[PDB]
Enzyme design. Structure first.
Site, short mmCIF file in Angstrom:
data_model
loop_
_atom_site.label_atom_id
_atom_site.label_comp_id
_atom_site.label_asym_id
_atom_site.label_seq_id
_atom_site.Cartn_x
_atom_site.Cartn_y
_atom_site.Cartn_z
N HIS A 41 0.87 -2.02 10.37
CA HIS A 41 2.30 -1.91 10.20
C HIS A 41 2.97 -1.17 11.34
CE1 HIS A 41 2.81 -3.82 6.33
NE2 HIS A 41 1.86 -3.07 5.79
N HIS A 70 0.81 -1.22 0.00
CA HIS A 70 0.00 0.00 0.00
C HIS A 70 0.85 1.27 0.00
CE1 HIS A 70 -2.14 -3.40 1.71
NE2 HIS A 70 -3.29 -2.82 1.42
#
Ligand SMILES: CCCCCCCCCCCC[N+](C)(C)[O-]
Length: 251
Positions: free
Chosen positions: A201, A157
């Site tokens: 993350h 992403h």
């Protein structure tokens, strides 16, 4: 000349701002209630599902702004495509050496009473299947954690949004709707933030995908420009100036 590479660089650095800030800061994730949905929208604009929509629109739009020197533009989007292939190649190739928890996994093993010592004293793939099962027992967010993984991998992403943004800043400072630059910049930052908020993350991972994004975009610009032809102002100096003097017109 090298100006692209200057801007690109600056761009990276700019986009490195937020995550390094966060990275240094000791922030941690945990439950909250409505943000998850917006962040999930933002990440879903990169997920593919849809798309593949953002990507194509940005592609074609870029091609418009990439006119004149468009000869290299295609080359450029080929190179990017190539690495993209290379990308999915390496991604699928190694899911062995990761062995790293995603922000939510820690909170999970904790909340679910899982001795960390014991948690890592167990296997490798069994750990992942156990995270899957612990997830089994909001809903869509669960769907996303399952679909993604237990282990944290590089940020696709981030890499994508950041490569777009970088392309935007770097290869056009000379104006085609500068709204495109600002928007890709804010959007990219929004995806990175989306990853953080969603327990997807660690900030270091974001930093690294931004760096990779940087190197990829850089090598791609230099190589596409090597053969053949750069942008650079295209004749479009005069056309962009013609669009510039139209700003003060009315009289
Ligand atoms: C987890 C998904 C794997 C992605 C593979 C590597 C992607 C790098 C490509 C970034 C380029 C984005 N761009 C500029 C073409 O839009």
């Amino acid at each position: 000349g090298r100006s692209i590479a200057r801007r690109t660089a600056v761009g990276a650095a700019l986009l490195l701002v937020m995550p390094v800030a966060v990275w240094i800061s000791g922030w941690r994730w945990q439950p909250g209630s409505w943000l998850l949905k917006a962040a999930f929208w933002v990440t879903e604009t990169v997920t593919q599902p849809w798309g593949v929509i953002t990507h194509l629109i940005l592609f074609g739009w870029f091609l418009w702004c990439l006119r004149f020197r468009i000869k290299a533009a295609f080359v450029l989007f080929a190179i990017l495509a190539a690495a993209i292939l290379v990308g999915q190649g390496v991604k699928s190739w190694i899911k062995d050496k990761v062995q790293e928890p995603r922000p939510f996994v820690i909170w999970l093993e904790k909340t679910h009473h899982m001795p960390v010592d014991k948690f890592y004293t167990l296997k490798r793939a069994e750990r992942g299947n156990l995270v899957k099962e612990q997830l089994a027992e909001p809903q869509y967010l669960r769907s996303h954690w399952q679909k993604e993984t237990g282990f944290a991998f590089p940020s696709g992403h981030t890499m994508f949004a950041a490569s777009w943004a970088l392309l935007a800043v770097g290869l056009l400072w000379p104006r085609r709707r500068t709204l495109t630059i600002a928007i890709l910049l804010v959007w990219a930052t929004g995806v990175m933030g989306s990853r953080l908020l969603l327990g997807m993350h660690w900030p270091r991972d974001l930093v690294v995908a931004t760096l990779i994004s940087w190197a990829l975009v850089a090598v791609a610009t230099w190589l596409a420009q090597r053969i053949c032809g750069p942008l650079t102002p295209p004749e479009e100096n005069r056309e962009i100036a013609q669009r510039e003097q139209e700003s003060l017109e009315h009289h």
